[PDB]
Structure 1
Amino acid sequence: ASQTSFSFQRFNETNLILQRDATVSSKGQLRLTNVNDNGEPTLSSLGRAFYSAPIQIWDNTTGAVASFATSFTFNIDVPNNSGPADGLAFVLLPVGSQPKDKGGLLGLFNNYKYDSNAHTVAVEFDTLYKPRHIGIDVNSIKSIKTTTWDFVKGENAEVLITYDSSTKLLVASLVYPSLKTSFIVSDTVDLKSVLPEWVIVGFTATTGITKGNVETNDILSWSFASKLS
């Protein structure tokens, strides 16, 4: 009864809600976090980017809950002498949601505990070394579930995140095409009890806070779909 779908290989401001350092470069890359004119990634960067149309995630009258999927290509690069930090995340957030905290909290949470009012589901790619990991975030930066991630700088990473409303299972996977490595994490998420009926979808990324802990957080392409019975 409701469907939404979009796909961009080249980003443009016009149908995005850009928050903070998120820009679309002249080459149409969604640079979530800031890169200076020298071409260097800057510390303490936070960017979020959302599709301009909200998505219905469930309907209280029917009790129906949406399924959804998103894929994107990201490039996280780290200059020599630096380590990576902090990562990026794909997020579903309430309509009108504004960025939260930088660094390890990814513009998503304001603390390291459970927060039922966060109404946040996220899959984060945590470049901060608990080893580097992909985490499923349900109302918490403390992933209810993680998997080790062998992060490699400068290599495009392709992500797929799916949520099945019937099983309630959220699945996130990352692949490095050029390195042919891959990582996956899955856990159940009751969206109905976590998210509002309508959400915005997109990204959030942060760079490290301390020198030598920095990265680019570029989304090179993005696709999203959701279906609500």
Structure 2
Amino acid sequence: SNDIYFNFQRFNETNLILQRDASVSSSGQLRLTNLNGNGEPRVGSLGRAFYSAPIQIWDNTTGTVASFATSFTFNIQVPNNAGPADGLAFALVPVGSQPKDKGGFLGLFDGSNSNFHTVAVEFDTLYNKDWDPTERHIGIDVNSIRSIKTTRWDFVNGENAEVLITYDSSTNLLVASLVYPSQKTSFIVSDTVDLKSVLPEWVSVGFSATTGINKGNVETNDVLSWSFASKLS
């Protein structure tokens, strides 16, 4: 068994790969998106962050896949007289992977057709006519910004959201859940995903987020703590 486990209750940039607007505040928070400087979520911001060490999600010589679980607490805040956009997502991406489109694409996809060998659990705050369900949701994305399945998520501005995502090698079951300790509300989604089919044996694990590309559609995308655990074979 080749295990890996880490838990960050305070972030620091030395063991993180930051891309674009991603940055770690002096207070130890992982801030995925910018500020127009005046303390307001910048428009058209895109930021990604990954753990500096690759994780082996599956082995092609033994044919085994890893089981994993991750939990993190994020906080999305929308400024007065503005709307949430575009969202935040946990993602398993190819090691050297570079950022993609802004806005509705969450920095993870193109809208083109290139195989992104990407799997992500998104927390969509803005409705996109072309592929999104009508209400804000939690979705499991497998190579497309069009979730393979979703669930209604009743977004609450400024409240800490606690997430738990788990993958089981045997059942190929991916389960994502979110709860607002303050609201005592909870949501859960689950579907089967075959990681061998879409992901490369080694992947970089992390977050990606974006703000709307239009003046009044912005939000902050901060992660306050994160823990990941993976067991292979």
TM-score (norm 1): 0.96
Amino acid at match of 1:209: I
Residues 76-98 of structure 1: per-residue CA shift (max 9 Å, x gap): 00001001001100000111111
Pairwise CA distance, 1:179: 1.3
Residue identity (%): 84
Amino acid at match of 1:118: F
Residues 16-48 of structure 1: per-residue CA shift (max 9 Å, x gap): 011111100000100001124422111111111
Q: Which residue of 1 aligns with 2:66?
A: 66
Q: Which residue of 1 aligns with 2:144?
A: 140
- Equivalent-residue separation in structure 1 for 2:59 and 2:73 (angstroms): 31
Q: Which residue of 2 aligns with 1:55?
A: 55
- Equivalent-residue separation in structure 2 for 1:210 and 1:202 (angstroms): 26
Q: Does the CA contact (< 8 Å) of 2:36 and 2:43 recur in 1? A: no
Are 1:121 and 2:119 an aligned pair? Answer: yes
**Number of positions where the alignment pairs a residue of Structure 1 with one of Structure 2:** 227
Amino acid at match of 1:165: S
Residues 64-123 of structure 1: per-residue CA shift (max 9 Å, x gap): 00111111110000001001001100000111111111100011110177x5x2111100
Amino acid at match of 1:11: F
SS, match of residue 73 in structure 1: strand
Structure 2 gap segments, 5+ residues each: 128-133
Are 1:204 and 2:202 an aligned pair? Answer: no
- Equivalent-residue separation in structure 1 for 2:102 and 2:229 (angstroms): 28
- Equivalent-residue separation in structure 2 for 1:120 and 1:37 (angstroms): 32
- The worse-fitting range, judged by mean Cα deviation, of 34-43 and 18-27 is 34-43
Q: Does the CA contact (< 8 Å) of 1:112 and 1:142 recur in 2? A: no
SS, match of residue 109 in structure 2: coil
Amino acid at match of 2:96: G
- Equivalent-residue separation in structure 2 for 1:34 and 1:177 (angstroms): 27
Are 1:179 and 2:177 an aligned pair? Answer: no
SS, match of residue 104 in structure 2: helix
- Equivalent-residue separation in structure 2 for 1:182 and 1:102 (angstroms): 28
Residues 121-148 of structure 1: per-residue CA shift (max 9 Å, x gap): 1000000131000000001110000001
SS, match of residue 192 in structure 1: helix
- Equivalent-residue separation in structure 2 for 1:24 and 1:167 (angstroms): 36
Structure 1 gap segments, 5+ residues each: none
Q: Does the CA contact (< 8 Å) of 1:112 and 1:141 recur in 2? A: no
Q: Does the CA contact (< 8 Å) of 1:112 and 1:140 recur in 2? A: no
Are 1:162 and 2:166 an aligned pair? Answer: yes
Among residues 171, 191, 194, which one is paired with 2:195 in the alignment? 191
SS, match of residue 48 in structure 1: strand
Q: Does the CA contact (< 8 Å) of 2:88 and 2:209 recur in 1? A: yes
Q: Which residue of 1 aligns with 2:222?
A: 218
> For residues 171 and 96 of structure 1, do their structure 2 counterparts lie closer, same or farther at Cα, with a shift above 3 Å needed?
same
Q: Which residue of 2 aligns with 1:75?
A: 75
Q: Which residue of 2 aligns with 1:105?
A: 105
